[PDB]
Design a protein around this ligand. Structure first.
Ligand code: NAG
Ligand code: MSN
Ligand code: ZN
Length: 1014
């Protein structure tokens, strides 16, 4: 295994180093506004060295944006695809590329057999070529790598089954900034090439000058280069026609033949296209070849890529004809005029890359190596696209909840083959497709119109219901005596209970377990642990009595703690945000212990008085002029007091001190260590009154944030043996800090209400001497070093926080893990900040045509980990990566893949069993089984199960930790007949494995395996 910490890769372009050196000046470069006047030597190309030009027709189809997926399919995409089939069928030389398989699958299943055969034929013959082949062209900032893989696999599996092709070239022309998580996943899925477009205009200028727009993109920690993927970055401001033929859009616009009038499009540079004729073809060719030779100067080979397309293009039959015929006249003239020394033709993306690599092999060019990312994107001036790292945060959190539910439903049901009548495959396909659809660059990004966000939400809601159904049917089968098991596939044996989604104050959706001496004395509950190691986690349920005790299935008592059910309300009468305690239901908390990738059953039993193994939390309401808070049957009385500073310690854990405002002030790791200053503060950013305004994409603050005026907030302290917490009602946020013995958990119920032009940020102030350095993650996969640059505006120093961020100095580190992607930064030494929500009354001029005024309450979750790191083996000062400690990685897993909770729905569960998975190996803590998926239906003689294994890299800080089992996924199911290593999409076998044993993977590597069973 390659060492991912100690060896700094040597690459030609390292983006953090490039950023440090670049000036970022925004000067007028002439017709190429963000570049310069390109010059070329006319004698560079000659009879023996011609410029080969591939014009690649394309149509960008968003699976939701200004319209929903179904509306665009009906109004535009079904017509684009129908006319592409007709025109390519009838014109053998025409070519077209297609990226979004969600739309293609939607179209193809509606075709009659004759058209299906014609479509398969134009794909097999090379006229229609799929690029990437994912369900969508995903966002690359907020998406979790697991869901980027999920959507890629969904579209590619559809393509292999129905079109018999697997793309090896990727096309990503619209995501707003680009992540190296894409070449990481693509290179492990069979890809050989990829293309990107939206990168900072200063980066396009810098790389163009050095002819570094084509490069071998490797991961930041990859010293050898085995992760490298050839990448082509487009050079100009847009992928539309005006910005794809060359540096001068006033000339290129004249070669978009859809802009002459009858289509309602025109050229903003004031010169329209004109039909190509024998009388003007020479002058037009002179102009066009000149743009092509200028564009060719920015690259190293004699093979030139000219995309020809835009959004929802190639719709009208007349549009196909006007583009095809005018370009064929230009090609016939250019190709026949020897003095141009050009050979131009329609082509596909693969054809372009194949030609480039043939030139490389002929020794005509060598390409630079590059590592890093392409965030944060700006398309012009100071317009940095950091707003969408936070826009529509409710759905960004929903994305992560569904991410986990899909994983759990696929894993729980993978253990057995199911009868078709159980509709397991059907429900899982729907869940995977709706989550895949939401990875679109206008889905999770929060950049769609209001009614479209509504459509994505409704789809995800159904996806969660489908997961619940599969999970609960699986638990009943996994824990019921086989000879007693008698399923009704439509019945609900268990209901899922989720403490953090939609969350308290967001939706009262949680059921109360109703017990009573005269009705039902006890209830079975079951926890699932999707991770491959034994795991303990406190779990909570709502119960109708405070007098409840817990036992495991050996009837062994389990220590529990009971607390009140607290809800916060804005009292429009008193004008205070204060908690109300339930007088009809309570919370029981206990530690569940669950096997690796398994299940554990516990029982809740009611009694008439305090049970021996159940304790009760004390409660203290701090506020001036308090009023009583009765708690129905709850034993202990609530106490009151004026606001004051407070300290709490659960177990052996850290001791947290809080201000009289209920916000963290310090953390003391051990009883004798110092109280390290760690202060939570909430502030707000506004919007500019003159000049460009923030919108769904853009973050354009009117200066540094200002403190939220807190007044005298109401603070609630609940102190328990197992769990304690301090909650405070602040304007727009009920902020809660929970302690269970280790790193605290933070929960924010964010309701921005009607505060227009406001962005609420949560900041952490410390005295850590981080300087201008901080770390953020990319897609939940890796942590990358960031350097705050005062030469760039505040919004440029904002980065995606898809799962976590940290700052450190030589001795101390503070890491904030998230249960949802949000935007954040470190704008001064010792600070961390992350945006909670943003409400914007104006549009930001990118075409969305609306502000963001559809905010809804969302519960954001976090883990805050303060730790000493003077003893950790960290990368050197020049290394571009960072790595989490064991505690921080487990803290991240607790937010993203918590234990799942099931409540038996009937009175009695006959045949109940206590545990499932006790014999599963408990793998090393840095290893995860990211995906477990049965790939075959029940009628298959040979069953196949696929696994994606991922190993992260954790810092070595002096903790021995050495007692775990080797995990061989191929032997998790019995009767294994074969084990193969495959691409990550499971579509190609790469290695027949000896002994039918699946090796574990190296730190930072991800592998896939498929076991076959007879
Ligand atoms: C699928 O594609 C491969 C590669 O061209 C071809 O050999 C095969 O015959 C095609 N059809 C089948 C059998 O799926
Ligand atoms: C140019 S804005 C961008 C448009 N290109 C459209 O495809 C959609 O994804 C939107 O967010
Ligand atoms: Zn788009």
């Amino acid at each position: 295994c390659q060492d991912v910490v100690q060896d700094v890769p040597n690459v030609d372009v390292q983006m953090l180093e490039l950023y440090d050196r670049m000036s970022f000046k925004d000067i007028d470069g002439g017709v190429w506004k963000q570049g310069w006047n390109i010059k070329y030597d006319p004698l560079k190309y000659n009879a023996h060295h011609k410029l080969k030009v591939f014009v690649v027709p394309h149509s960008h189809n968003d699976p939701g944006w200004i319209q929903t997926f179904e509306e665009y399919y009906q109004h535009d995409t079904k017509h684009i695809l129908s006319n592409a089939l007709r025109h390519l069928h009838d014109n053998p030389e025409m070519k077209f590329i297609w990226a979004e398989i969600s739309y293609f699958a939607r179209f193809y299943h509606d075709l009659g057999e004759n058209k299906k055969l014609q479509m398969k034929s134009i794909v097999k013959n090379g006229q229609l070529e799929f690029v990437t082949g994912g369900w969508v062209m995903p966002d690359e900032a907020n998406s979790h790598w697991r869901n980027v893989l999920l959507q890629l696999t969904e579209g590619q599996t559809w393509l292999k089954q129905f079109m018999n092709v697997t793309p090896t070239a990727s096309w990503a022309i619209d995501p707003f900034g680009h992540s190296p998580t894409m070449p990481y996943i693509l290179q492990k899925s069979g890809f050989k090439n990829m293309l990107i477009q939206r990168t900072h205009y200063s980066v396009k200028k810098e790389l163009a000058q050095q002819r570094q727009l084509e490069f071998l993109w490797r991961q930041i920690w990859d010293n050898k280069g085995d992760t490298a993927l050839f990448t082509h970055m487009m050079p100009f401001y847009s992928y539309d026609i005006p910005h794809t033929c060359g540096p001068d859009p006033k000339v290129c616009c004249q070669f978009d033949f859809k802009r002459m009038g009858s289509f309602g499009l025109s050229c903003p540079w004031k010169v329209p296209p004109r039909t190509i004729s024998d009388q003007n073809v020479a002058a037009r060719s002179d102009l066009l070849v000149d743009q092509w030779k200028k564009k060719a100067e920015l690259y190293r080979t004699n093979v030139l890529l000219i995309p020809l397309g835009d959004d929802f293009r190639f719709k009208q039959n007349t549009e196909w004809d006007v583009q095809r015929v005018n370009y064929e006249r230009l090609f016939e003239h250019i190709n026949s005029q020897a003095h141009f020394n050009v050979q131009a033709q329609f082509g596909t993306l693969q054809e372009y890359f194949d030609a480039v690599h043939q030139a490389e092999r002929a020794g005509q060019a060598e390409f630079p190596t590059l590592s890093g990312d392409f965030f944060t994107y700006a398309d012009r001036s100071d317009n940095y696209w950091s707003g969408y790292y936070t826009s529509r945060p409710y759905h960004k959190r929903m994305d992560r909840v569904l991410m986990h539910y899909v994983r759990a439903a696929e894993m729980l049901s993978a253990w057995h083959s199911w009868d078709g009548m159980a509709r397991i495959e059907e429900r899982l396909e729907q869940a995977r497709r709706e989550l895949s659809l939401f990875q679109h660059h206008d889905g999770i990004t929060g950049t769609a119109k209001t009614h479209v966000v509504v459509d994505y939400e409704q789809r995800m809601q159904e996806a969660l219901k489908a997961c619940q159904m599969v999970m609960q049917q699986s638990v009943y089968r996994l824990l019921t005596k086989p000879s007693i098991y008698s399923p009704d596939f439509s019945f609900s044996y268990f209901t899922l209970d989720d403490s953090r989604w939609p969350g308290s104050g967001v939706e009262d959706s949680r059921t109360t377990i109703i017990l009573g001496e005269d009705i039902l004395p006890s209830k079975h509950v079951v926890m699932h642990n999707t991770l491959p190691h034994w795991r303990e986690q406190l779990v909570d349920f709502y119960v109708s009595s405070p007098f409840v005790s817990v036992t495991d299935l050996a009837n062994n008592p389990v220590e529990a703690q009971v607390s009140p059910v607290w809800s916060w309300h804005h009292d429009t009468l008193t004008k205070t945000i204060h908690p109300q305690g339930s007088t009809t239901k309570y919370r029981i908390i206990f530690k569940a212990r669950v096997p690796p990738m398994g299940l554990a059953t516990y029982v809740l039993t009611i009694s008439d008085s305090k049970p021996e193994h159940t304790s009760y939390a004390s409660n203290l309401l701090l506020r001036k002029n308090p009023t009583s808070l009765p708690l129905g049957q709850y034993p202990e009385d609530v106490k009151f007091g004026d606001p004051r500073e407070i300290s709490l310690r659960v177990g052996n854990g850290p001791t947290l001190a809080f201000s009289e405002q209920g916000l963290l002030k310090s953390i003391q790791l051990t009883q004798d260590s110092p109280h390290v200053p760690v202060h939570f503060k909430f502030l707000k950013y506004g919007v500019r009154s003159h000049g460009d305004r923030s919108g769904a994409y853009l973050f354009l603050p009117n200066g540094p944030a200002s403190p939220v005026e807190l007044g005298q907030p109401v603070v609630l302290v609940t102190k328990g043996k197992l769990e304690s917490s301090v909650s405070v009602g602040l304007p727009s946020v009920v902020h809660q800090t929970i302690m269970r013995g280790g790193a605290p958990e933070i929960r924010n119920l964010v309701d921005i209400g009607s505060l227009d032009n406001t962005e609420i940020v949560m900041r952490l102030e410390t005295h850590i001497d981080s300087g201008d350095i901080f770390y953020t993650d990319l897609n939940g996969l890796q942590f990358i070093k960031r350097r705050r640059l005062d030469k760039l505006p505040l919004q440029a120093n904002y980065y995606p926080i898809p799962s976590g961020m940290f700052i450190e100095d030589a001795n101390t580190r503070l890491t904030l893990l998230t249960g949802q992607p949000l935007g954040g930064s470190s704008l001064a030494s010792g600070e961390l900040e992350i945006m909670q929500d943003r409400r914007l009354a104006s549009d930001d001029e990118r075409g969305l045509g609306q502000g963001v005024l559809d905010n809804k309450p969302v519960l954001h979750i976090y883990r805050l980990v303060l730790e000493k790191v003077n003893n950790c083996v960290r990368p050197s000062k020049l290394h571009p990566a960072g790595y989490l400690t064991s505690a921080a990685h487990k803290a991240s897993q607790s937010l993203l893949d918590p234990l799942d909770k099931f409540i038996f729905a009937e009175n009695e569960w006959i045949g109940a069993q206590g545990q499932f998975g006790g014999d599963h190996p408990s793998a090393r803590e840095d290893l995860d089984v990211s995906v477990m998926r049965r790939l075959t239906k029940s009628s298959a003689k040979t069953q196949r199960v696929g696994y994606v294994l991922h190993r992260t890299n954790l810092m070595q800080c002096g903790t021995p930790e050495e007692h775990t089992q080797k995990l061989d996924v191929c032997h998790l199911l019995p009767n294994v007949a074969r084990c193969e290593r495959t691409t990550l999409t499971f579509l190609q076998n790469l290695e027949h494995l000896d002994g039918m044993v699946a090796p574990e993977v190296c730190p930072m590597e991800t592998a896939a395996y498929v076991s076959s069973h007879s």
